[PDB]
Amino acid sequence: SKIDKTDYDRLLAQHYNSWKVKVATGIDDLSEDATPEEQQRAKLILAQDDILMHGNHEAKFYTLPETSLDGFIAAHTQ
Amino acid sequence: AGLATIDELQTLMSTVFEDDALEQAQLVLDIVSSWARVVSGQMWPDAPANVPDDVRAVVLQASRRELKNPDRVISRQMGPFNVQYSQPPDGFFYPAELAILKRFKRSGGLMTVSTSRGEEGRPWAGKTAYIRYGDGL
Amino acid sequence: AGLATIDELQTLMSTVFEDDALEQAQLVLDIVSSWARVVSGQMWPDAPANVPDDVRAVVLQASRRELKNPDRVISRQMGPFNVQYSQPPDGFFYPAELAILKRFKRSGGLMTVSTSRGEEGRPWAGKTAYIRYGDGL
Amino acid sequence: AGLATIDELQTLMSTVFEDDALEQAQLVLDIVSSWARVVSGQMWPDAPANVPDDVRAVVLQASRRELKNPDRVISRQMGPFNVQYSQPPDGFFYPAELAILKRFKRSGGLMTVSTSRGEEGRPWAGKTAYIRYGDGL
Amino acid sequence: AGLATIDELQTLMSTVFEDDALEQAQLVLDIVSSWARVVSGQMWPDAPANVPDDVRAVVLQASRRELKNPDRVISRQMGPFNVQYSQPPDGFFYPAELAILKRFKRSGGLMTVSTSRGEEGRPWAGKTAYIRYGDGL
Amino acid sequence: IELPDAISDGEVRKLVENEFWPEFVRRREKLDRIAQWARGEQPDYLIQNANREKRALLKLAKTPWLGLVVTHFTQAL
């Protein structure tokens, strides 16, 4: 049961927070004609060539570090 | 539009609107109701039916602010009499009023946008090449 | 609505409300009660029955502040007489009043939102494939 | 162009425009409508037909500011009478008004540009060298 | 040059230009049109033909500012009458006007310059040494 | 498709054109596709048809791997 609990904890860490979450602050909200969860296929193009830019000097782009995902493997091995 | 009526605004201002002042007050109230509707994000189809007390309060206060001074003056004096108002907010909806209005927004307001790498995706290249070798079940 | 009544407000202001002043005071008190209700998050079905002394104090003080000056004037003088007020708070309640009002909120106010990765989840793909090989117990 | 008409502006200002004042007000409204259109990014072919209440409020407010003072005066006094205005915005719209004007923009406004390394690309160097060795199917 | 004409400027200023005032206004408008052209980067061959409403608004506003005060006076008074303008723009335009003018620039304005290491390059040292050993096809 | 007991001595083409040729083509298209897959050009689940540079890079990355495995298996028999 402890082994399965450790595996479940590792899966929870990997499935929910395992990538650097890109967030933005300072930009406006309620855009796209006050989106009532309509037309969810925004399809905002984001690739290596694409460069994000906004018309506001107060806009800040932050990143959220993810779990290192190293202690779980050692715990499961133990 | 028209979240609030004109009688309660008249009682709040302790005055009665007439001639073009009534029309001006109605236009101001409709404008402020539109601002509150776009800020909150809801529609309120039946305007003076549900219209929670929070949005009524916000629109009444904003209309009173607009009527008191439309040019957003700081200090105004006429000889011996002087009066100096506080700092006007960016447009209407003082930050507390903006926070109250944004209550109706879904979740905590941290809405996200689904980005993409300029790809459509065809999840069938490899599955339709299988040839039926059974009984057709 | 109407957390507070009009008699104690009259005693606090040491004046009596009449004509449209009573209606204006009642409207202001109802607005302040609605704001306190939405800030605290509770409902208070029987308004002037439980109505703890903290919210009564908050609404009475806010109503007095609004009655004294609705335009949030900083300095007002007429001839020889002059008077200057402090900085008006954002919204209706001072930060101490807002902190007192937010007491009734559950826990310490650090409420969370349950996020998801756009997945529904089917915890049965692998369990229903088992064929009963026993006595049916 | 001309998102807003002249009658509602007259009601808002509680005055009537006549002679060159009417023409000046119409020109100012056209300028403000053009600025709002270019800020939002939309076209609004039928100008006074759809014209949501948000852009009507924006254009009416900006026209009122432009008519009240075209020189962006901070403080103006003539003898005993004195009046001081707030800080004028950079454009015809305050920063709060700009965000709601930018609401109609697609997505959250974080539009991107597709860069390149100065290369055209020829994804056929190696495929056309194959010689048909089958039945031509 | 001359993106804008003189009639709409006269209507905006509610005055008629005559004698050297008309010539001064025309010269100022030509200067402003040249500055807007150089800021935007376009040419506008037929000046009063396409001339989008944005640049017309910008040039009319700049002409009005220049005519109102060419010395960039902050506060000016004569006797009882006093007036105090806001902070004048740096060259002619506020940052919002400059941002609107720079709309016509290609891409987002992040143009680049192709640097080099002081080298010409000869991509043929090794290819022309091959001697034709075939049929000349 | 159906299995005919008779050999259709005088009407073999009639049976072929309506029972064998459609099935033969249906199998042939899949066999040709898998043969093309074997000799490089792996199935591209994601392909960008709007950018020429991206398409060229994707085509340049089509490393043949299954063909190598097939050649290795068939050269030891």
GROMACS .gro file of C-alpha atoms in nm, chain B residues 8 11-12 14 53-54 57-58 61 64 80-86 96-97 100 103, chain C residues 20 24 27-28 30-31 34-35 38 70-79 91-92:
model
   42
   86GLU     CA    1  -3.407   5.587  -0.604
   89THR     CA    2  -3.404   6.005  -0.337
   90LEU     CA    3  -3.028   5.954  -0.303
   92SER     CA    4  -3.252   6.446  -0.250
  131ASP     CA    5  -2.805   4.528  -0.474
  132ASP     CA    6  -2.429   4.543  -0.538
  135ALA     CA    7  -2.521   5.050  -0.551
  136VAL     CA    8  -2.226   5.072  -0.790
  139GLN     CA    9  -2.269   5.588  -0.692
  142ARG     CA   10  -2.396   6.047  -0.864
  158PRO     CA   11  -1.518   8.306  -0.035
  159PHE     CA   12  -1.657   7.957  -0.100
  160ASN     CA   13  -1.408   7.681  -0.182
  161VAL     CA   14  -1.430   7.304  -0.223
  162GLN     CA   15  -1.163   7.045  -0.308
  163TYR     CA   16  -1.260   6.691  -0.403
  164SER     CA   17  -1.043   6.380  -0.375
  174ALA     CA   18  -1.322   4.875  -0.452
  175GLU     CA   19  -1.623   4.913  -0.682
  178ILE     CA   20  -1.709   4.424  -0.620
  181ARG     CA   21  -1.730   3.920  -0.824
  235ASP     CA   22  -3.678   6.288   0.191
  239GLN     CA   23  -3.212   5.901   0.164
  242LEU     CA   24  -3.137   5.400   0.105
  243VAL     CA   25  -2.778   5.472   0.212
  245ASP     CA   26  -2.948   4.960   0.273
  246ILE     CA   27  -2.660   5.014   0.029
  249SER     CA   28  -2.560   4.516   0.106
  250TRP     CA   29  -2.191   4.607   0.073
  253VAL     CA   30  -2.122   4.096   0.006
  285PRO     CA   31  -2.122   6.207  -0.050
  286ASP     CA   32  -1.865   6.371  -0.279
  287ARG     CA   33  -1.562   6.264  -0.068
  288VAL     CA   34  -1.445   6.623  -0.024
  289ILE     CA   35  -1.094   6.671   0.114
  290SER     CA   36  -1.111   7.038   0.216
  291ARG     CA   37  -1.424   7.256   0.217
  292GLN     CA   38  -1.443   7.617   0.335
  293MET     CA   39  -1.703   7.894   0.317
  294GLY     CA   40  -1.559   8.235   0.401
  306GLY     CA   41  -1.501   5.213  -0.135
  307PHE     CA   42  -1.698   5.265   0.184
   0.00000   0.00000   0.00000
